[PDB]
Chain length 362, copies 5
Amino acid sequence: LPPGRLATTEDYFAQQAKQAVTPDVMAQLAYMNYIDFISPFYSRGCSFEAWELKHTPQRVIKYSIAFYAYGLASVALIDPKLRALAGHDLDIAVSKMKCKRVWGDWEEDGFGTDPIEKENIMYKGHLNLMYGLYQLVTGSRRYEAEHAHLTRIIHDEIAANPFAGIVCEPDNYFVQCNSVAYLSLWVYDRLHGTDYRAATRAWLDFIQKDLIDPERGAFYLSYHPESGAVKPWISAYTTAWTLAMVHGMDPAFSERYYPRFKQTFVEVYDEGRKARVRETAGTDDADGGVGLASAFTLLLAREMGDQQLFDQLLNHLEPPAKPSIVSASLRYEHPGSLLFDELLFLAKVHAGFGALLRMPPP
Amino acid sequence: ELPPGRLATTEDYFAQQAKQAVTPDVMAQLAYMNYIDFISPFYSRGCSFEAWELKHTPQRVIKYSIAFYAYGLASVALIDPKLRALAGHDLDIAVSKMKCKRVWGDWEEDGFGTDPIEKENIMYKGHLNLMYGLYQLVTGSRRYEAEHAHLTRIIHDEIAANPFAGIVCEPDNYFVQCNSVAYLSLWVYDRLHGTDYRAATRAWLDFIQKDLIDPERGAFYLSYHPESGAVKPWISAYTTAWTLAMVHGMDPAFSERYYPRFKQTFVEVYDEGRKARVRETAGTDDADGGVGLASAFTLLLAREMGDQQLFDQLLNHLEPPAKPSIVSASLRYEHPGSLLFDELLFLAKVHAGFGALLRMPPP
Amino acid sequence: LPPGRLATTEDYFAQQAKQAVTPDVMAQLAYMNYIDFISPFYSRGCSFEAWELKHTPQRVIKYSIAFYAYGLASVALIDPKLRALAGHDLDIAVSKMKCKRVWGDWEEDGFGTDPIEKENIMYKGHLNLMYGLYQLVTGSRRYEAEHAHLTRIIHDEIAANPFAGIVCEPDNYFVQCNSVAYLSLWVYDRLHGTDYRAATRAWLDFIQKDLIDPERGAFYLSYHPESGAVKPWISAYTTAWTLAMVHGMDPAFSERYYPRFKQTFVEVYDEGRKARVRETAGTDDADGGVGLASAFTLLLAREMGDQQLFDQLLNHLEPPAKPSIVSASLRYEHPGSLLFDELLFLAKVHAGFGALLRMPPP
Amino acid sequence: LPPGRLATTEDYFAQQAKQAVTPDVMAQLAYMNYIDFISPFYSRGCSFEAWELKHTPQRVIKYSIAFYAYGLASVALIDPKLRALAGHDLDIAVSKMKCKRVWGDWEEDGFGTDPIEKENIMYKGHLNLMYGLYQLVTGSRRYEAEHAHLTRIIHDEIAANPFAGIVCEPDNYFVQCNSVAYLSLWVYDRLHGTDYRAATRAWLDFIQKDLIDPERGAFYLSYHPESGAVKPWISAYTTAWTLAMVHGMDPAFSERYYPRFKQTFVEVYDEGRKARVRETAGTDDADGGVGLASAFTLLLAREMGDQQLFDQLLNHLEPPAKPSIVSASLRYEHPGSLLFDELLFLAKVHAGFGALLRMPPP
Amino acid sequence: ELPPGRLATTEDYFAQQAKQAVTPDVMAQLAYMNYIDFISPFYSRGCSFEAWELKHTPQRVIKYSIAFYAYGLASVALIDPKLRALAGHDLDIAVSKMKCKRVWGDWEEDGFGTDPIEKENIMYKGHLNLMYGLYQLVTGSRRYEAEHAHLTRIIHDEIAANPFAGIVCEPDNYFVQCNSVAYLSLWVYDRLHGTDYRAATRAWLDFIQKDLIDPERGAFYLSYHPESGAVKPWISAYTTAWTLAMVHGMDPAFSERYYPRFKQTFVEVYDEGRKARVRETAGTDDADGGVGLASAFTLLLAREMGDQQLFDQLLNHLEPPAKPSIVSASLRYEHPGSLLFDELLFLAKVHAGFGALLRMPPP
């Protein structure tokens, strides 16, 4: 237990077997739920005080909510006594995700008045995955009509496109953002016995052509179908997020690229006690770009069962951020990136995307 | 004997009603409330909120500020017959300010509706309905009687319509504190008119004793969410202190049963017995976490239960660091330690008991 | 002539006999009139630059204009060569008084769209007194129709109310504010031979019941007719303003209470050379509340012919404020209160409300 | 050539004989014309970047444009090679003068939606003089319709008023502002053979009654026809501006008062090398009020052919302001007043208002 | 060869096309342009200008920023076939951002009209038209062909309608730089379509040489104003550098005649021949006055004329004080010395010549 660390890696990995979250995870849930008005999961309303206080840029709120939600889904698997609370928070998550504050960039940028109708997989992929996870956790059909409608839109759009998948902004294809959408299809299928996930093989074949550098185990930044262009830089955060989600659909795909990913991007330091992750090739700097390579790699390490790397990354990420528990609730004095408490929460509890898919009923 | 940094003895606060007079520091708080033109909080009926802008009161809290002032004014009316007219006048202002959009408008801004009274929002309309009743008990005026009947009928109907006992605040958030205000407003209505709206109280007291309370610790959980059935797994001291204080006016035995356990669970006596401070939740040594009101609401609860020792301990903790002075016969705190600070200290200093407010004799 | 004092008390009191204002009063008039655009009496328009530069709160602008106006009226009596200028400034005063910036608090507070129609004596009492004074000074009938219309409203409202007088905000009765209104009736009567002032005796009888403490010579803060409440604090500024105005209508009333007022509130200090005024009972602090007790008492001392107290108060008030005459125009580096230059101006020139009433024609 | 001075007084006065502006006047014209977007005479559009960068208050922008324009008219007389450029700048001047940013104070103050219709001679007097000067310089008829319309309005309003002239704001009469309007009538007459200028004699007779102190050679600050009031302070900037323009209409009028004006207001100092100008009587302070007495007196000295006083004033004004020439363009580090570069430019080039009137054609 | 604050040699920039590869620092500039989510300038087609807000680019200049990036991308396409698709993609984004109201809206705000294309405003629409043509040469795509034909016809018609050769920017302001862009857009249209819109070029080149140039100094005057006939009497180095660079792609002999004289008039070599800086006007020793772009546009000109020595001198002056650094394979300047700084340095580093862009072979 180094300074600035709250629990051992062994303890995080044991939560599910012990049917209990660690005290610090509980204290995170308290940050999420406790204080009136300002806690992020206080109400269904279009109130964003929590994100104003954290200074979360508007474009990022949608990811904040999504990643909290994916964490809450694993809380539900870990502790049956917390499943009702998790369901309640996922309900709030879904209802906040639909507020114009969250999606309104789509309109402000000039792309349309409806965030669901065509394109914008960055938003609606997450929303659709959230709808499914809500239902798996709770058994409630509150959103089932919307979920079916959005799942059908996604399916249809995939079928209509010459490339496998869907764009975010018009003409910008991102493999991370697609991975969320395809995973939402697997969840829908689990809930309804359908076969929307059959599209997955063609997508996995496609992202293995020009979009990946197979020797380095890394995806290029984006694809642009009008011109055919693949941006020539590889991206660590892009790859970590993508391999983590793909591991729940096609474990063998991620198992093949994971070791090469590590070789390409991960730097172990401080006599093996720490690790940090380079965002691109041709640099020794860690956490360039959006600054999320290390955080998404923490998640990936959790997904792949790599305790050693998880421990190394968390020794790098957590202590400089200065965690403390005040009134049984977790705060960080110095969050090192965007989506900081969200991604650390998620990675601490994450039961595996495959296990979320197979979640037993309430 | 007067502890350091304190304005009057606990013995003096408790004696106010028997002496038929407020202490000089309570009078000075009433001057802060009433004296200076335009900027005193009870200067006018208008939708003017200068006093709250100067205190930096967040908008979501203004409704509670007005409510707790009002509950204090009601006790001022019982304490000193010569101040009853003034207290009535201030309660009139209280009610009329409580209806300004500045106070309730969060309901609309959050997307929950254009009418703060129509359904849900018991956080707002519970207090408003209690204020309507108290105004009438103090003054004998029927100025708000129509509105009072209309709102009391809405509350009644909504309780009757719900599968759980009570009413939510936001949609799908149930809070026992907020309900307690509403049920109390029914008792006040019944006192004024001879009705039996309060009959719903027993089913509510049975209900909050099921999953919402930890009976061994004497503490309520934070909230309930009827759609999912979830009860948030943290107990809360401010929630419990507020709820037990109000319930004591409806069912004294309920609060007497839980009060000693509440104290064991949350209250930390320190400084060789001279002080006390209150933990907001279990699993922590930190005092006044969360909203930071556990100590202040526990001061009120102590007053309600007649617990002079704990009152004295809490006020020794709360008041001195806040640095009271009286300038021009008016009370200011240099360093208020929390939200609702002068409000709750005023209320607790004068509070005659919710039961005694209920039975308040006419003018 | 102590430091920070510009002229002797003997000189202020001699202005009228010498038919000339002191050089520092002339310099105040220059501050009022000289510089294009930013001087307060530059134009009729709804331009408030002068008050923005002084940081005058909006609620106070109406009193600023009023007290300037009452001063200008005495300038007209003092120097026949300045009477035309004074008339001009009063014209501007009246027209600025009618701008929404001045009265608009009435609407913003929710009390109505018309500042004249009902209640709001705090505004319309002053406006009605200004209309009369304008006419006495100039002989002009520019506002006569409005003056008659407003005088009739005031008269009718007094007649309609069970208590003697008119409220400011609904349910708030203030004796200061009423005193202005009753004085406006005396001025109307002087100009037109009417008997609106007959209501005065019933008002003077009324304010001597629960509204005054006759032993201490002090009025309570306010009265609230719905509840019957009289606020239990006495107020020095309230009483000083009221007694000054009443002295013009019923000199004996003010002569009876003035000595007792001084005993109650006035603190002589610095071996008789200075004085400062406590705002309420039960305190040794001076100039609490709105912070105007000393300034209004300066006015009262002028009204009562009390040279000694005037001198004492001005020794307290003027020097710490650091007067400066640059060009031939008066500025204060450190005004000690609201309405600072207004009230010092007024008190320096004030010829008595009774003398304004009997002002000979142009 | 003292420090902080760019050319000799002898050189400024010789520009017209040499048919060339001095290098520093050229560098001023470069400041006016050179840089993209931020130069004041870059475009016809309603863009005011240049005035935002100088922090020019909105009420003053109309005078800035006017005084630049009067300077450009003299540039046209001085150098035939610069006349086309001067015409171009005057075109821009006229078109910017019509933007709401310039005149909109009229509306904001509550006086009306049309700046031309009635009163507001402060704006429309300058606009009308600018129209005429534009035409004299260029021969273009682009604004001739507007010029005839505005000249008729001015003529009619003079004819309708019981006093000789026109007010600015309602009930404020200023002789400076009138002098511009009357001069505009002389320019119209020169262009069209009309006799609008016949009104001039009645105006000159009028301003010599209560509006001037003939012994001191100084005009009072303003006149207010409703009350009959003349403000009792004399003003140096008011008088300097008025006498300069009147010299182009009735040279004998200004020749009579100029020596007395100097005795009253001008202080020679620094062993005869400098001068500075008091704004009013009863003070030793220089450049009080609006702070323009010295700058307008520089213009007057140029108009009267007083080389000695011009030199003295410029030695006072220019050096403390710290002129710099960078990229062949003139900047002042520390301008000492409003309208600083405008008035120094104007006074450096000014050929006399009489000579502008008699400007030979293109 | 390789001074401090320089990233690659002049010999390396000039060799890019022969080596069919951009230098690492040019690649790092493309990464600044393309890499980070949401804040990179070429992230999306949308009307999002975060990248320009972060650089503090004034709104009036955004149009030029986009244009000069675009001209640079066109040369990237000629240099490296493997980057041509990327360049096309970025040009697509360029065009679509150029059409946002944030870019052109000054036209409306200034009072000149609601439509930026309809008339005048060659400052905007000249660049837009050149961008349309370059997009099509790089990609083969006809996405903008209709708009390109429409705008090319407007320009052609307006030239034909005017008594002077060319088109104004603001009403009654004629600038030769701005015109040079428009005429060059006609040549690109003609390349793509076999038309003869470029025939107007000869009359324009004769015109700008009769009244708007000082032929001994090799320098254009600042502007022309047809209503008055006025030519502003100051010569301008940035105006001349930009104009001669573009004219070199249409009439090489015209620029070859004036280039040496331009240099004598404005260019100051210093530091024992290792550096150079450019005076903006005559009658001054100060460098980079006015808009402060003389040196940067002269850098471009030097590249266009094949003048390695002057290019090297200018870049030794411009680049090091700006403090270039490569962080995560992406180029940042700590202290950009002017407006359009990274744009113009990018452009000049890659610029293959306007004549070579015109003749660009198909994909």
